[PDB]
Enzyme design. Structure first.
Site, PDB file in Angstrom:
ATOM      1  N   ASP A 199      50.461 -76.877  16.179  1.00 50.32           N
ATOM      2  CA  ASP A 199      49.320 -75.893  15.466  1.00 50.32           C
ATOM      3  C   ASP A 199      49.896 -74.794  14.981  1.00 50.32           C
ATOM      4  OD1 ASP A 199      49.964 -74.853  17.689  1.00 50.32           O
ATOM      5  OD2 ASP A 199      47.931 -74.651  18.515  1.00 50.32           O
ATOM      6  N   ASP A 228      59.892 -78.332  17.999  1.00 47.16           N
ATOM      7  CA  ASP A 228      60.170 -78.102  19.462  1.00 47.16           C
ATOM      8  C   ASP A 228      59.557 -76.806  19.919  1.00 47.16           C
ATOM      9  OD1 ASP A 228      61.836 -77.168  21.921  1.00 47.16           O
ATOM     10  OD2 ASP A 228      62.565 -79.359  21.954  1.00 47.16           O
ATOM     11  N   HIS A 247      70.492 -80.542  20.034  1.00 50.20           N
ATOM     12  CA  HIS A 247      71.739 -79.586  20.481  1.00 50.20           C
ATOM     13  C   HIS A 247      73.091 -80.266  19.705  1.00 50.20           C
ATOM     14  CE1 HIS A 247      69.293 -77.514  23.633  1.00 50.20           C
ATOM     15  NE2 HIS A 247      68.749 -76.943  22.435  1.00 50.20           N
ATOM     16  N   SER A 253      51.633 -72.540  16.698  1.00 50.09           N
ATOM     17  CA  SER A 253      51.497 -71.500  17.647  1.00 50.09           C
ATOM     18  C   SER A 253      52.857 -70.653  17.632  1.00 50.09           C
ATOM     19  CB  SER A 253      51.397 -72.032  18.782  1.00 50.09           C
ATOM     20  OG  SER A 253      52.320 -73.181  19.144  1.00 50.09           O
ATOM     21  N   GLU A 305      66.924 -66.242  18.886  1.00 53.25           N
ATOM     22  CA  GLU A 305      67.765 -67.180  19.249  1.00 53.25           C
ATOM     23  C   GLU A 305      69.244 -67.272  18.411  1.00 53.25           C
ATOM     24  OE1 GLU A 305      68.810 -70.596  18.937  1.00 53.25           O
ATOM     25  OE2 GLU A 305      70.607 -70.751  20.258  1.00 53.25           O
ATOM     26  N   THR A 323      50.901 -74.046  23.344  1.00 53.40           N
ATOM     27  CA  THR A 323      49.932 -75.075  23.244  1.00 53.40           C
ATOM     28  C   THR A 323      50.692 -76.501  22.866  1.00 53.40           C
ATOM     29  OG1 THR A 323      49.735 -74.595  20.805  1.00 53.40           O
ATOM     30  CG2 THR A 323      48.263 -73.372  22.366  1.00 53.40           C
ATOM     31  N   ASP A 351      57.145 -75.028  18.710  1.00 52.20           N
ATOM     32  CA  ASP A 351      56.011 -74.973  18.223  1.00 52.20           C
ATOM     33  C   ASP A 351      55.279 -75.828  19.711  1.00 52.20           C
ATOM     34  OD1 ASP A 351      53.101 -75.835  17.485  1.00 52.20           O
ATOM     35  OD2 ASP A 351      53.689 -75.038  15.556  1.00 52.20           O
ATOM     36  N   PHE A 363      49.481 -78.967  20.921  1.00 49.22           N
ATOM     37  CA  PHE A 363      49.101 -79.489  19.606  1.00 49.22           C
ATOM     38  C   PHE A 363      50.073 -78.764  18.741  1.00 49.22           C
ATOM     39  CE2 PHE A 363      45.298 -80.919  21.314  1.00 49.22           C
ATOM     40  CZ  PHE A 363      44.866 -80.174  22.312  1.00 49.22           C
ATOM     41  N   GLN A 387      64.164 -77.696  15.619  1.00 47.80           N
ATOM     42  CA  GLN A 387      63.830 -76.611  16.541  1.00 47.80           C
ATOM     43  C   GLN A 387      62.760 -75.939  16.335  1.00 47.80           C
ATOM     44  OE1 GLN A 387      66.685 -73.399  16.100  1.00 47.80           O
ATOM     45  NE2 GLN A 387      66.733 -72.802  18.204  1.00 47.80           N
TER      46      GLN A 387
HETATM   47  C1  HEM Z   1      71.612 -72.128  19.947  1.00 48.73           C
HETATM   48  C2  HEM Z   1      70.439 -73.017  20.148  1.00 48.73           C
HETATM   49  C3  HEM Z   1      70.325 -73.890  19.113  1.00 48.73           C
HETATM   50  C4  HEM Z   1      70.882 -73.918  17.421  1.00 48.73           C
HETATM   51  C5  HEM Z   1      71.942 -73.197  16.937  1.00 48.73           C
HETATM   52  C6  HEM Z   1      69.206 -75.048  19.464  1.00 48.73           C
HETATM   53  C7  HEM Z   1      68.716 -75.930  18.738  1.00 48.73           C
HETATM   54  C8  HEM Z   1      67.784 -76.724  19.085  1.00 48.73           C
HETATM   55  C9  HEM Z   1      67.246 -77.641  18.104  1.00 48.73           C
HETATM   56  C10 HEM Z   1      67.862 -77.964  16.688  1.00 48.73           C
HETATM   57  C11 HEM Z   1      66.365 -78.399  18.797  1.00 48.73           C
HETATM   58  C12 HEM Z   1      65.592 -79.876  18.386  1.00 48.73           C
HETATM   59  C13 HEM Z   1      65.923 -80.605  17.214  1.00 48.73           C
HETATM   60  C14 HEM Z   1      66.158 -77.738  20.006  1.00 48.73           C
HETATM   61  C15 HEM Z   1      65.340 -78.204  21.183  1.00 48.73           C
HETATM   62  C16 HEM Z   1      65.170 -77.482  22.508  1.00 48.73           C
HETATM   63  N1  HEM Z   1      65.961 -76.413  22.735  1.00 48.73           N
HETATM   64 FE1  HEM Z   1      67.512 -75.491  21.643  1.00 48.73          FE
HETATM   65  N2  HEM Z   1      68.785 -74.599  20.660  1.00 48.73           N
HETATM   66  C17 HEM Z   1      69.586 -73.457  21.025  1.00 48.73           C
HETATM   67  C18 HEM Z   1      69.460 -72.863  22.415  1.00 48.73           C
HETATM   68  C19 HEM Z   1      68.471 -73.433  23.514  1.00 48.73           C
HETATM   69  C20 HEM Z   1      68.666 -72.618  24.992  1.00 48.73           C
HETATM   70  C21 HEM Z   1      69.120 -71.655  25.391  1.00 48.73           C
HETATM   71  C22 HEM Z   1      67.502 -73.147  25.417  1.00 48.73           C
HETATM   72  C23 HEM Z   1      67.084 -72.997  26.947  1.00 48.73           C
HETATM   73  C24 HEM Z   1      67.734 -73.939  28.019  1.00 48.73           C
HETATM   74  C25 HEM Z   1      67.334 -73.878  29.253  1.00 48.73           C
HETATM   75  O1  HEM Z   1      66.891 -74.746  30.063  1.00 48.73           O
HETATM   76  O2  HEM Z   1      67.224 -72.458  29.740  1.00 48.73           O
HETATM   77  C26 HEM Z   1      67.122 -74.070  24.535  1.00 48.73           C
HETATM   78  C27 HEM Z   1      66.039 -75.119  24.969  1.00 48.73           C
HETATM   79  C28 HEM Z   1      65.675 -76.083  24.020  1.00 48.73           C
HETATM   80  C29 HEM Z   1      64.439 -76.873  24.487  1.00 48.73           C
HETATM   81  C30 HEM Z   1      63.568 -77.145  25.797  1.00 48.73           C
HETATM   82  C31 HEM Z   1      62.423 -76.175  25.584  1.00 48.73           C
HETATM   83  C32 HEM Z   1      61.392 -75.595  26.701  1.00 48.73           C
HETATM   84  O3  HEM Z   1      60.403 -76.599  26.684  1.00 48.73           O
HETATM   85  O4  HEM Z   1      61.474 -74.935  27.585  1.00 48.73           O
HETATM   86  C33 HEM Z   1      64.233 -78.111  23.246  1.00 48.73           C
HETATM   87  C34 HEM Z   1      63.126 -79.149  23.131  1.00 48.73           C
HETATM   88  N3  HEM Z   1      67.798 -74.145  23.215  1.00 48.73           N
HETATM   89  N4  HEM Z   1      67.021 -76.831  20.004  1.00 48.73           N
HETATM   90  C1  LIG Z   2      66.223 -70.752  21.856  1.00 48.14           C
HETATM   91  C2  LIG Z   2      65.636 -71.036  23.196  1.00 48.14           C
HETATM   92  O1  LIG Z   2      64.774 -72.045  23.345  1.00 48.14           O
HETATM   93  O2  LIG Z   2      66.316 -70.006  23.751  1.00 48.14           O
HETATM   94  C3  LIG Z   2      65.947 -68.679  24.096  1.00 48.14           C
HETATM   95  C4  LIG Z   2      64.685 -68.015  24.043  1.00 48.14           C
HETATM   96  C5  LIG Z   2      64.555 -66.461  24.428  1.00 48.14           C
HETATM   97  C6  LIG Z   2      65.521 -65.487  24.596  1.00 48.14           C
HETATM   98  C7  LIG Z   2      66.722 -66.292  24.503  1.00 48.14           C
HETATM   99  C8  LIG Z   2      67.157 -67.766  24.528  1.00 48.14           C
HETATM  100  C9  LIG Z   2      68.385 -68.433  24.772  1.00 48.14           C
HETATM  101  O3  LIG Z   2      68.748 -68.735  25.888  1.00 48.14           O
HETATM  102  O4  LIG Z   2      69.699 -68.149  23.962  1.00 48.14           O
HETATM  103 CA   LIG Z   3      51.646 -75.548  19.644  1.00 47.89          CA
END
Ligand code: HEM
Ligand SMILES: CC(=O)Oc1ccccc1C(=O)O
Ligand SMILES: [Ca+2]
Ligand SMILES: *[C@@H]1O[C@H](CO)[C@@H](O[C@@H]2O[C@H](CO)[C@@H](O[C@H]3O[C@H](CO)[C@@H](O)[C@H](O)[C@@H]3O)[C@H](O)[C@H]2NC(C)=O)[C@H](O)[C@H]1NC(C)=O
Ligand SMILES: *[C@@H]1O[C@H](CO)[C@@H](O[C@@H]2O[C@H](CO)[C@@H](O[C@H]3O[C@H](CO)[C@@H](O)[C@H](O)[C@@H]3O)[C@H](O)[C@H]2NC(C)=O)[C@H](O)[C@H]1NC(C)=O
Ligand SMILES: *[C@@H]1O[C@H](CO)[C@@H](O[C@@H]2O[C@H](CO)[C@@H](O)[C@H](O)[C@H]2NC(C)=O)[C@H](O)[C@H]1NC(C)=O
Ligand SMILES: *[C@@H]1O[C@H](CO)[C@@H](O[C@@H]2O[C@H](CO)[C@@H](O)[C@H](O)[C@H]2NC(C)=O)[C@H](O)[C@H]1NC(C)=O
Length: 595
Positions: A188, A108, A351, A190, A258, A184, A110, A186, A105
């Site tokens: 990095d 990601d 997830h 961020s 989160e 970003t 980053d 990269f 997470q």
């Molecule tokens: C609660 C949530 C987590 C754990 C308890 C969790 C965990 C991860 C891991 C471990 C990931 C990769 C190894 C990972 C990647 C990405 N997430 Fe997730 N995440 C939790 C909750 C959320 C929620 C809510 C979102 C947003 C969904 C949406 O589409 O509205 C979410 C997103 C992502 C995401 C997309 C990021 C983006 O580029 O905008 C991953 C690559 N996570 N999470």
């Molecule tokens: C965790 C993830 O990528 O989600 C969030 C980021 C900012 C605020 C709320 C959320 C979420 O939907 O739980």
């Molecule tokens: Ca970055």
């Protein structure tokens, strides 16, 4: 006939061209093409977008228009018929700690972030969408199935807002809709410092020339620092317990709060920056604040890249590691370092690795307190459990001692995330992360499962029998066909996550390809990659190789017992050892004399 004019909505500025530090926005990494990989731009497209009307409408938006001749099943039904399960026993990964999930997470966040659309300041759309489920504009509600328990208890739908796109954001049309990456590309750090000049500044401690990040002033954790609290009310972190009234933390990335384990990680990084900062001053007293900040910042950037590529990807990709990410060969200015739109969905394999609980362990690694094992859902946006319930050490011990959840074809995403997920904007613990994911695939115009198999040079099943063989599972292949009527319609997120895992890996063939190509690129196209001659000196690189997450722990917490390989599953006390035995990062190589 290209079109790379559009653009304005992107904080731009001049480049330095011989500066040793990355910019905050990511600009100027690539000299010939300055905005490549920069924050606040479109996610790259590896394949053309696929929309209902070919431009911007998602599939499943117009209930009559089909995809390849069929209706695409509701994201929630798919969630209900394939993703859910009730029995948590026997679901834990026997050889991957809770930190394995957590680091993922962190990498990601980053790399990517596609924020949802606004116009919602003092808005009724914000309500025309949750109260009445009326589909329209950026409101693309997730409807509930017949016989869904949430019907009887929650409503007719789950609110959902479409992701932002480029050029504008309001009522737009003309070219194919491309989502934004607010961070970003990269690798990095961020997420620690931010991707915008404004936030980056507000995060720094400018009342003194030590080059330190601002820290909380209301509470300390046994003398150790906390991320500062966030200004903005209404705060979600205080909504979950109005009596504790502890707001969310302010960090380089907005998703930092989160879940409690993500906030713990962020704090660990913040602390390392300051540590690194007061240490560098000690060896180079003349250095001013800027120099201390940039120098530490660059060390930390090198830290995340190392842990990720040396200790993390090898156990995600498994034996596929070498097939996609060959030994490093130097910076390649022709490699596009942009995060692809589909990657943000491929990386969501994580997830299905999140267990239903989080534990706290006292100093002997025994349950801390009576109510030591908490259900995940009680910890979304929960900062009060840190500030008022023991600090981060108890949580960090859980990260080293507990296991991740193993991905399983009959047990994919825990109910903690599938039925009780909490949203900022909303007031209940009743969302479905699995359904959101599928809904987001369509919002982003993703090609179907078979388009990506072809892209990765893998067979493309057209028949039930074909899918059974690829999934190597009769029943799942079956549920998937009854709902999608053709493997060409299976959303990439579930399609990719339903495949068996490769040897020594935690993802299947399709994902390994998608993940592998993305990381190869962010590495080869990063002018500041830590192994790139000239970025760091030979002697600084010999030092950076001894970095360990175990060590990061030792120096920033009061934990004296840590595993040597914090990602594999370790048993206390046999697999734990005193911090006094763990390699430390040697900074003397950063000492710069005069005269
Ligand atoms: C609660 C949530 C987590 C754990 C308890 C969790 C965990 C991860 C891991 C471990 C990931 C990769 C190894 C990972 C990647 C990405 N997430 Fe997730 N995440 C939790 C909750 C959320 C929620 C809510 C979102 C947003 C969904 C949406 O589409 O509205 C979410 C997103 C992502 C995401 C997309 C990021 C983006 O580029 O905008 C991953 C690559 N996570 N999470
Ligand atoms: C965790 C993830 O990528 O989600 C969030 C980021 C900012 C605020 C709320 C959320 C979420 O939907 O739980
Ligand atoms: Ca970055
Ligand atoms: C639990 O997961 C562990 C990591 O996946 C695994 O141990 C790893 O096994 C590999 C086998 O290839 C070894 O990897 C290292 O081998 C040499 C060191 O002798 C290095 O030169 C290589 O580059 C490579 O990194 C290690 O023995 C080990 N890897 C690490 C990083 O510790 C366990 O076997 C798994 N447990 C079970 C029961 O399967
Ligand atoms: C909202 O946050 C509250 C804390 O700010 C929390 O209550 C706190 O937690 C327990 C109560 O369950 C108390 O701690 C326990 O330990 C003390 C040690 O002195 C003992 O006296 C008791 O056994 C006590 O239970 C905290 O003192 C308590 N604080 C307050 C102000 O109540 C609430 O439970 C949280 N509410 C929700 C819904 O999560
Ligand atoms: C910015 O850094 C300064 C200096 O390190 C911090 O000030 C110190 O704060 C701690 C605890 O409050 C104590 O050592 C002293 O009160 C301060 N020392 C000095 C020399 O000023 C300050 O807290 C930081 N500011 C923020 C917002 O984090
Ligand atoms: C630098 O990166 C480029 C872009 O990925 C690599 O280009 C490939 O090289 C082959 C052989 O010259 C070309 O025929 C292909 O058109 C390129 N493939 C793609 C997908 O673009 C190049 O190999 C790399 N060069 C070095 C020295 O690492």
């Amino acid at each position: 006939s290209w079109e790379v004019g559009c653009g304005a909505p992107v904080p731009l500025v001049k480049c330095d061209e011989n500066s040793p530090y990355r910019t905050i926005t990511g600009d100027c990494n690539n000299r010939r093409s300055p905005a490549l990989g920069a924050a606040n731009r479109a996610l790259a497209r590896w394949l053309p977008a696929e929309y209902e009307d070919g431009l911007a409408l998602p599939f499943g938006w117009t209930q009559r228009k089909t995809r390849n001749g069929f209706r695409v099943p509701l994201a929630r039904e798919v969630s209900n018929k394939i993703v859910g399960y009730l029995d948590e026993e026997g679901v834990l990964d026997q050889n991957r700690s809770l930190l394995f999930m957590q680091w993922g997470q962190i990498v990601d966040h980053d790399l990517d972030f596609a924020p949802e659309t606004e116009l919602g300041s003092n808005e009724h759309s914000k309500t025309q969408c949750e109260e009445y489920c009326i589909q329209g504009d950026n409101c693309f509600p997730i409807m509930f199935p017949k016989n869904d328990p949430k019907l009887k208890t929650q409503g007719k739908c789950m609110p959902f807002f479409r992701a932002g796109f480029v050029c504008p954001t309001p009522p737009y049309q003309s070219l194919a809709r491309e989502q934004i990456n607010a961070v970003t590309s990269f690798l990095d750090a961020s997420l620690v410092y931010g991707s915008e000049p404004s936030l980056a500044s507000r995060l720094r401690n400018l009342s003194s020339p030590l080059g330190l990040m601002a820290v909380n002033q209301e509470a300390w954790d046994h003398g150790l620092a906390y991320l500062p609290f966030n200004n903005k009310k209404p705060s979600p972190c205080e909504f979950i317990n109005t009596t504790a009234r502890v707001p969310c933390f302010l960090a380089g990335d907005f998703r930092a709060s989160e879940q409690i384990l993500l906030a713990t990680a962020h704090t660990l990084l913040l602390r390392e920056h300051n540590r690194l900062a007061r240490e560098l001053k000690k060896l180079n007293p003349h250095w001013n604040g800027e120099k201390l900040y940039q120098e530490a910042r660059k060390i930390l950037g090198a830290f995340i890249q190392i842990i990720t590529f040396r200790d993390y990807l090898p156990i995600v990709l498994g034996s596929e590691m070498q097939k996609w990410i060959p030994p490093y060969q130097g910076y390649n200015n022709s490699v596009d370092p942009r995060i692809s739109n589909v990657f943000t969905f491929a990386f969501r394999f994580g997830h299905m690795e999140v267990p239903s609980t989080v534990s706290r362990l006292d100093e002997n690694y025994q349950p801390w307190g009576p109510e030591a094992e908490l259900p995940l859902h009680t910890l979304f946006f929960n900062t009060w459990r840190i500030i008022k319930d023991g600090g981060i050490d108890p949580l960090v011990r859980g990260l080293l001692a507990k296991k991740s959840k193993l991905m399983n074809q009959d047990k994919m995403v825990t109910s903690e995330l599938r039925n009780k997920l909490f949203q900022p904007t909303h007031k209940i613990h009743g969302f479905d992360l699995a359904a959101i994911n599928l809904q987001r695939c369509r919002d982003h115009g993703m090609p179907g499962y078979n388009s990506w198999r072809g892209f990765c040079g893998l067979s493309q099943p057209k028949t039930l029998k074909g899918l059974q063989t690829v999934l190597k599972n009769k029943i799942l292949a079956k549920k998937l066909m009854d709902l999608y009527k053709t493997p060409d319609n299976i959303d990439i997120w579930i399609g990719g996550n339903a495949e068996p895992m490769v040897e020594r890996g935690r993802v299947g063939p399709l994902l390994a390809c998608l993940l592998g190509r993305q990381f190869q690129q962010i590495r080869d196209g990063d002018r500041f990659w830590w192994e790139n001659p000239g970025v760091f000196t030979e002697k600084q690189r010999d030092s950076l190789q001894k970095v360990s997450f175990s060590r990061l722990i030792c120096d920033n917490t009061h934990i004296t017992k840590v595993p040597l390989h914090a990602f594999q599953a370790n048993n206390y006390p046999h697999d734990f050892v005193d911090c006094s035995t763990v390699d430390k990062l040697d900074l003397s190589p950063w000492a710069s004399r005069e005269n």
